Amino acid sequence: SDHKFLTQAVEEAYKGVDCGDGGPFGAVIVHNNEVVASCHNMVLKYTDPTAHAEVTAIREACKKLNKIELSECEIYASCEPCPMCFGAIHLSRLKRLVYGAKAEAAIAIGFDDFIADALRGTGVYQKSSLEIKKADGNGAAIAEQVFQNTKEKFRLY
Amino acid sequence: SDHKFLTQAVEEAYKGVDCGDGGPFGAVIVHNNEVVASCHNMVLKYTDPTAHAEVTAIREACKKLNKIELSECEIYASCEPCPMCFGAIHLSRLKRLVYGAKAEAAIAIGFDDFIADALRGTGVYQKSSLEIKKADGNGAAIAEQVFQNTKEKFRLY
Ligand SMILES: O=c1[nH]c(=O)c2ncn([C@@H]3O[C@H](CO)[C@@H](O)[C@H]3O)c2[nH]1
Ligand SMILES: O=c1[nH]c(=O)c2ncn([C@@H]3O[C@H](CO)[C@@H](O)[C@H]3O)c2[nH]1
Ligand SMILES: [Zn+2]
Ligand SMILES: [Zn+2]
């Protein structure tokens, strides 16, 4: 099931960059194999620098489920969540995170050198016991290729 | 001017608690002593765990100026911004953060031990360049008092 939802996040990244909503980032929030939210980066469409794919997905899932905690849900991110998005995942009480590409793949096409210490376990104050899986193999290769594939179809931000 | 805007952020915190919008947190974004945004936590109002005072203020400031970067603006937070909000502050390119109370003040009254390494200077992957001022004296007293005064006047989240 991990491959299915990570693939959906990747295709959301492509869709969002193709419609000009924002950058090539997708996020899918699922509740026991039922997709609650399927979103991409909306920074350009919303004129909102916080409207990352993950934050957008959290907003939508919480509004749809009428609760501010997503402890029964998991989030699939096309790319490794940034510090803001990882903090949002923590505040959401999401119980699992699966992400496709490492943040370096986005940094390679010019994005901010902006990586969540708590995700990589390199913090003094911020810790995390969130279950975190970095995908490998097939879906991971596809997810990493997103940034080379889309790098001239959108504005950096 | 720092004290005036920090006190307005604290006033926003009290205001938001009174109307049941969310927790005792406020944020004011200014552009050369002109207020661009004045908000409080809206997590309960919006059913959105990302709607912290800082994130709400960034969204509204960027909507008012019709741009996704706030490089000429400064932000005043009644309480030390969390990892999510400090990440959003990074992404917004706000050039200066002035915050009132230490995160320990919010932790003492029930909020998560959820502290941003990059704000306190212990981040490894996240490196902030923005100027950061922790308020002293009367401003610190105001901001810390927020959490004693609003104890059990709001629903925790
Ligand atoms: O988690 C993220 N979600 C996004 O939508 C997004 N859009 C851009 N970025 C930037 O990509 C880099 C790798 O996380 C960081 O510079 C992010 O700010 C994003 N990070
Ligand atoms: O930066 C923040 N803005 C808020 O609105 C807010 N509301 C609650 N909290 C929590 O307070 C603690 C200290 O920052 C952390 O547990 C935050 O999640 C907040 N942090
Ligand atoms: Zn992000
Ligand atoms: Zn916050």
Residue numbers in the entry:
A (entry chain D), B (entry chain A): 29 to 185
The authors write:
The other involves the hydrolysis of Gua to guanine (G), followed by its deamination to xanthine under the action of guanine deaminase (GDA). The zinc ions are tightly bound to the active site, coordinated by the completely conserved residues His80, Cys113, Cys110, and the key water molecule. AtGSDA catalysis needs two key sub-processes: the activation of water and re-capping of the active site, which proceed via the two critical residues Glu82 and Tyr185, respectively.
As a reference, we first cocrystallized the natural substrate Gua with the WT enzyme. The quick soaking process (within 2 min) resulted in the complete deamination. Specifically, the essential C-terminal loops of the enzyme would re-cap the active site by forming the key contact with N7 of Gua via the side chain of Tyr185. However, it was not difficult to tell that Xan stabilizes the enzyme more than Gua.
